[PDB]
Amino acid sequence: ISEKDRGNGFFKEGKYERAIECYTRGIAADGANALLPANRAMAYLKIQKYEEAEKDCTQAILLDGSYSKAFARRGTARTFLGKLNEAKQDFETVLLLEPGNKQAVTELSKIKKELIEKGHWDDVFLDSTQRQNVVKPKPLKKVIIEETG
Amino acid sequence: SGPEKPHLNLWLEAPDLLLAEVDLPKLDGALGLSLEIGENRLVMGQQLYHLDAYIPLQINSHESKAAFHRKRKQLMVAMPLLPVPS
Ligand SMILES: [Ca+2]
Numbered sequence: 001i002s003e004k005d006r007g008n009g010f011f012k013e014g015k016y017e018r019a020i021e022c023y024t025r026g027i028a029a030d031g032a033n034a035l036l037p038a039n040r041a042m043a044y045l046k047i048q049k050y051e052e053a054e055k056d057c058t059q060a061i062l063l064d065g066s067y068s069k070a071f072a073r074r075g076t077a078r079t080f081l082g083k084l085n086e087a088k089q090d091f092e093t094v095l096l097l098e099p100g101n102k103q104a105v106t107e108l109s110k111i112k113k114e115l116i117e118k119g120h121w122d123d124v125f126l127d128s129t130q131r132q133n134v135v136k137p138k139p140l141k142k143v144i145i146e147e148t149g
Numbered sequence: 150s151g152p153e154k155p156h157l158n159l160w161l162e163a164p165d166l167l168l169a170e171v172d173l174p175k176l177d178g179a180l181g182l183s184l185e186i187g188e189n190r191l192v193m194g195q196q197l198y199h200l201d202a203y204i205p206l207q208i209n210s211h212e213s214k215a216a217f218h219r220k221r222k223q224l225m226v227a228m229p230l231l232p233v234p235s
Contacts, residue, residue, distance in 0.1 A: 109163040116227045121216050125170070125225055128162055135159035135167065137202040140185040140192060141210035145224070147179050148216045 003029060004036055011039075016046045034063035038070045045077060053077040068097040075107060084115050085123045092129065121148050152199040159204070167206060169226035173198060179217040186210045186228065193224065207231040 007022030023040035030036065041056035057074035060067055075090035088111045094104040112124050158170035175197055176182065185192035188208055193200040209229040216225050 105164065109166055112162055112166060113227075113229065116214055119216075121218070121225055121227075124162065124227075125168065128160075128168070130162050131158075131160050133161040135161060135204065135206060137157065137159065137204060138187050138190065140187050140190070141213070143184045143186055143210075143213055143215050143226075145179040145182055145184055146214075146216045147219060148225075149218050149220045 002026070004033075004039060007039065007043075011043055014046075016043045019043045032063065034060040034067055034070065037063075038067065038073060041070075041073050041077070045073065048080075050077045050080040054081065066097060068094050068101070071097070072101075072103060075104075079107070079111065084111050084118075085120065087111055088115065088123070088127075119146070119148060152196050155193075155198050155200055157200065157202060165230040165232075167204070167208065167228040167230055169224075169228065171200065171224035171226070172222065173217070173224055174222045176217075176222065177219065182217065182224075184215050184224070184226070186213050186226075188231075191226075204228075207233070 003022050003026035007019040007026065010019035010022065020040055020043050023036050023043065026036045027040070037056040038060040041053040044053035044056060054074055054077045057070050057077065060070040064070065071090040071093045075087045075094070078087035078090065088108065091104045091108050091111065094101050095108070098104070115124050156172045160168055162168045171193060181195045183194040186208055187210060189204055191200065191202040191204055207230055209231045213226065213228045215227070218225060
């Protein structure tokens with residue numbers, strides 16, 4: 001009977017817009033619960049409403065500052081919106097709340113590579129946390145050296 | 150006299166991403182600087198600096214990129230790793 005439980009039913013059946021109605025009704029009847037906005041952000045993702053999904057995730061994060069799944073959904077949403085550096089900061093937060101989260105490790109590689117491809121070297125090299133994973137030191141390949149800063 | 154071996158920083162930013170940081174203070178500008186990356190080797194070559202290092206990891210040379218930071222006088226390398234054997 002819970003408006004969230006009723007919304008989850010439509011969600012399993014792939015009826016995404018009808019689950020949002022239930023999630024909206026559940027939000028307007030319980031603004032403190034962080035499950036409802038995160039659930040509605042997940043349904044927004046299923047219909048490529050990435051802008052609307054980011055706000056629903058931030059609302060959930062404000063309510064619960066440790067909601068790992070909320071950072072995850074905002075991370076994918078921010079990638080589709082192009083906010084790569086902001087997406088990287090979310091998935092690295094997940095990696096702190098859930099060390100070894102496989103979705104986080106995968107999406108972090110895919111993001112940190114596209115950031116370097118676009119030239120945002122400092123966003124990767126300066127904000128890096130894994131600097132302690134030291135690595136102590138056949139045709140060759142000439143790699144051109146662009147500039148930055 | 151001769152070319153000096155610079156200071157190198159290596160770490161795993163990701164399981165399949167290896168990052169490098171070479172300090173080149175006496176150097177300025179990417180012009181006249183060459184970088185060669187093999188499967189297990191890193192060659193940085195004007196003859197002010199020279200660095201011939203061996204890396205214990207499988208480097209994807211084709212998809213590797215580099216950049217000389219002018220403010221910090223550093224050469225930054227991004228070396229994606231090749232898929233490991235099953
Ligand atoms: Ca709060």
